[PDB]
C-alpha cells in the first residue's frame, strides 16, 4: 500500500474541475464529433477557421466563473479530434488560432487567467486526429507531430497543472510510444498531472490519474499494491454532448449534477463538470444556470468537498447516505430529505427521520447541518459502532439535494 506522490495528493484535494469543450465544431452547435459523424466535406468544414474570431472568449470571465462554482482546476480542449489547435503551434501547423482571425494564443490567455484565480490549468489533447494525413498515411511521423504539439504546451506557458489525454477511438494495438511522450512531459513539467482516459495494469508508469465512468458504484482502483498510487476522475456533461449542441434538450437535472459531485467524492475520485462554449467562446446561458446552482451547493459543502475522503463507514439498509472523513471531522452526506411544512401543511420532512451509520467508534460531542448550523439529536452504540441521527428535513424555502452534517468528536 503506497501513498500518493505530493502532486497527486494535491490533485485529489482539487475535488472539482470544469471541463471546457471549444473548437471549430462550436460554430455548428451540433456536437463536437460533427465532422466525422455527419460525414462532412473536410475541406468545407476546415473553412470554419476563417470565422473563428473568438470574439466573445474572455479567459478572465471563465476563470472567475470556475472560481465561483468552487472548481479548483479547468481542463480546456487545446486540440480535439477535428485537429485544430487553440494555441500558437510555432510552425508545427497552419491549422491553429494564429492563422485564424482571432490571432490570439488562447491557451496563453487561459493560463494567465487560471493563475490569477489560483486555478490549475489543464490541457486536453486528442490523440485521434482527423486533420493531419500523417495519422493514417505515416503513423510514426504522426507520433512525432503529436509529441511536438505537446512539447509546445510544455515549454511555452510556464508550469502547467496537467494534461488530459484522450486516447479513445484509436488504432488497436498500435505502439503509441507512451514512454517517450510522457518522459518528455516529465522532463519539462516534472510537477504536471498526467490524466489518461485509457489509463487502464496502467498503460504507463507516468500516468497519475485514470478516468472512470460516473456510474461506478464503489471506491475506485488505485493501482497494484506496492506500486505507484494512481488517482481517479469522473466526468459529467450537462446534456448528451460535450461540445455545444443547440437542439439537445435532454439536460440532466441540477439535482442529479449535485448527486454526481457528491458521488465522486464518496468513491474517492475527482469530478469534472463539462460546459461547451458557443462558436465565439462565450459560456452559454444554460451552462451559467447549472454553474450558479452548483456553486451554491459547493460553497455550502466547502468544509468537506476538497479534503473529505472515503472511510469504512456504511449507512443503514435502504438509504443512500455516506460519510466523508477529514483529519478533524467526519461528515454525514444525507440524501432523500424533504422540506418541512407547518401544522396542517405537510411537505414530507416533518417526522423524526432516524438515519444510521455503522463504523463510527468514537464518542460524539455535537452534530450539526452545514447549511444552517442546526444541532441534530443522535444516539450511539460504541461497541457495535452504530450512530443514529434524527436527520431533520429542509427549512421551507430551501432544498440542498445532498445535505451535509458535520460531526464534532469529544
Choose between 32 and 88: whose C-beta lies nearer to ligand FUC.
Answer: 32
Cβ of residue 215: shortest distance to its own copies, in angstroms? 15
Touching its own copies, residues 366-405 (CB under 8 A): 371, 395-401
Which residues have C-beta within 8 Å of that of residue 16, sequence separation ≥ 6?
A: 69, 70, 71, 72, 261, 270, 271, 272, 273, 298, 305
Which residues have C-beta within 8 Å of that of residue 38, sequence separation ≥ 6?
A: 30
User: What residues are paired with 342 via a beta bridge?
Assistant: 345
Choose between 200 and 293: whose C-beta lies nearer to its own copies.
Answer: 293
Cell 499494491, located at residue: 225
User: The C-alpha cell of 138 is what?
Assistant: 505515416
CB atoms within 10 A of CB 375: 12
Which residues have C-beta within 8 Å of that of residue 317, sequence separation ≥ 6?
A: none
Cβ of residue 229: shortest distance to ligand FUC, in angstroms? 24
State yes or no: residue 240 binds ligand FUC (CB under 6 A).
no
State yes or no: residue 359 binds its own copies (CB under 8 A).
no
Binding mask 281-320 for its own copies (x = CB under 8 A): ----xx-xx--xx--xx-----------------------
Number of residues that this document lists for the chain: 410
Cβ of residue 63: shortest distance to its own copies, in angstroms? 20
Mind giving me the DSSP string for 310-360? E-S-EEPTT---EEEE-SS-EEEEE-S--EE-BTTB--S--S--EEEEE--
- Choose which of 27, 147, 216, 239 interacts with its own copies (CB under 8 A): 239
Touching ligand FUC, residues 27-66 (CB under 6 A): 32-33
- Choose which of 46, 166, 206, 233 interacts with ligand FUC (CB under 6 A): 166
Cβ of residue 129: shortest distance to ligand FUC, in angstroms? 12
* Cβ atoms 63, 117 nearer than 8 A: yes
* Cβ atoms 163, 178 nearer than 8 A: no
* Cβ atoms 147, 89 nearer than 8 A: no
Cα–Cα separations (whole angstroms), residue 153 to 107, 138, 185: 9, 23, 9
CB atoms within 10 A of CB 292: 13
Could you tell me how many residues of this chain bind ligand FUC (CB under 6 A)?
7
Angle at alpha carbon of residue 316, lines to 315 and 317, rounded to 5°: 125
- Choose which of 235, 315, 392, 406 interacts with ligand FUC (CB under 6 A): 235
Choose between 226 and 247: whose C-beta lies nearer to its own copies.
Answer: 247
Angle at alpha carbon of residue 25, lines to 24 and 28, rounded to 5°: 115
- Choose which of 87, 242, 297, 369 interacts with ligand FUC (CB under 6 A): 242
- Choose which of 41, 201, 226, 344 interacts with its own copies (CB under 8 A): 344
State yes or no: residue 109 binds ligand FUC (CB under 6 A).
no
What does 242 interact with, of ligand FUC, its own copies, none (CB < 5 to 8 A by kind)? ligand FUC
Only one of the segments 32-40, 180-188, 308-316, 382-390 lies at the binding site for its own copies (rule: CB under 8 A); that segment is 32-40
What does 222 interact with, of its own copies, ligand FUC, none (CB < 5 to 8 A by kind)? none
State yes or no: residue 34 binds its own copies (CB under 8 A).
yes
CB atoms within 10 A of CB 98: 17
State yes or no: residue 11 binds ligand FUC (CB under 6 A).
no
Helix (H, G, I), strand (E, B) or coil at 150: helix
Cα–Cα separations (whole angstroms), residue 323 to 103, 263, 390: 50, 11, 16
Interface with ligand FUC by CB under 6 A: which residues?
32-33, 166, 168, 197, 235, 242
Interface with its own copies by CB under 8 A: which residues?
28-31, 33-34, 36-39, 169, 239-241, 245-256, 258, 285-286, 288-289, 292-293, 296-297, 339, 341-342, 344-345, 371, 395-401
Amino acid at each position: 500500500m503506497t501513498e500518493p506522490l505530493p502532486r497527486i495528493q494535491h490533485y485529489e484535494d482539487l475535488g472539482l474541475g470544469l471541463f471546457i469543450h471549444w473548437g471549430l465544431y462550436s460554430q455548428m452547435a451540433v456536437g463536437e464529433w460533427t465532422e466525422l459523424i455527419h460525414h462532412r466535406n473536410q475541406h468545407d468544414y476546415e473553412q470554419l477557421i476563417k470565422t473563428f474570431t473568438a470574439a466573445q472568449f474572455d479567459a478572465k470571465k471563465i476563470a472567475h466563473a470556475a472560481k465561483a462554482v468552487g472548481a479548483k482546476y479547468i481542463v480546456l480542449t487545446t486540440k480535439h479530434h477535428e485537429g485544430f489547435f487553440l494555441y500558437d503551434t510555432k510552425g508545427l501547423s497552419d491549422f491553429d488560432v494564429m492563422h485564424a482571425p482571432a490571432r490570439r494564443d488562447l491557451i496563453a490567455e487561459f493560463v494567465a487567467a487560471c493563475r490569477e484565480e489560483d486555478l490549475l490549468p489543464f490541457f486536453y489533447m486528442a490523440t485521434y486526429d482527423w486533420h493531419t494525413p500523417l495519422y493514417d498515411d505515416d503513423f510514426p511521423a504522426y507520433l512525432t507531430y503529436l509529441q511536438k504539439s505537446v512539447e509546445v504546451l510544455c515549454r511555452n506557458y510556464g508550469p502547467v497543472g496537467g494534461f488530459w489525454f484522450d486516447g479513445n477511438w484509436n488504432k488497436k494495438d498500435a505502439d503509441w510510444h507512451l514512454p517517450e511522450l510522457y518522459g518528455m512531459i516529465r522532463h519539462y513539467q516534472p510537477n504536471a498531472i498526467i490524466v489518461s482516459n485509457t489509463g487502464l495494469q496502467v498503460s504507463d508508469p507516468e500516468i497519475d490519474v485514470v478516468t472512470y465512468e460516473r456510474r461506478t458504484p464503489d471506491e475506485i482502483y488505485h493501482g497494484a499494491p506496492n506500486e505507484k498510487y494512481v488517482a481517479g476522475e469522473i466526468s459529467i456533461t450537462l446534456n448528451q454532448h460535450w461540445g455545444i449542441a443547440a437542439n439537445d434538450l435532454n439536460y440532466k437535472s441540477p439535482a442529479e449534477m449535485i448527486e454526481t459531485v457528491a458521488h465522486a467524492r464518496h468513491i474517492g475520485a475527482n469530478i469534472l463538470v463539462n460546459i461547451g462554449l458557443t462558436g465565439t467562446g462565450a459560456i452559454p446561458a444554460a451552462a451559467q444556470t447549472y454553474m450558479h446552482l452548483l456553486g451554491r451547493w459547493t460553497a455550502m459543502a466547502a468544509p468537506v468537498l476538497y479534503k473529505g475522503r472515503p472511510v469504512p463507514v456504511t449507512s443503514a439498509h435502504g438509504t443512500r447516505d455516506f460519510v466523508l472523513h477529514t483529519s478533524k471531522h467526519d461528515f454525514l452526506c444525507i440524501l432523500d430529505l424533504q422540506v418541512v411544512g407547518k401544522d396542517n401543511v405537510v411537505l414530507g420532512g416533518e417526522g423524526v427521520n432516524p438515519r444510521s451509520f455503522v463504523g463510527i467508534g468514537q464518542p460524539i460531542q455535537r452534530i450539526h447541518w452545514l447549511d444552517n448550523d442546526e444541532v441534530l439529536s443522535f444516539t450511539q452504540d460504541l461497541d457495535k459502532k452504530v450512530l443514529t441521527v434524527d436527520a431533520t428535513g429542509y427549512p421551507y424555502g430551501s432544498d440542498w439535494v445532498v445535505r451535509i452534517a458535520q460531526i464534532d468528536y469529544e
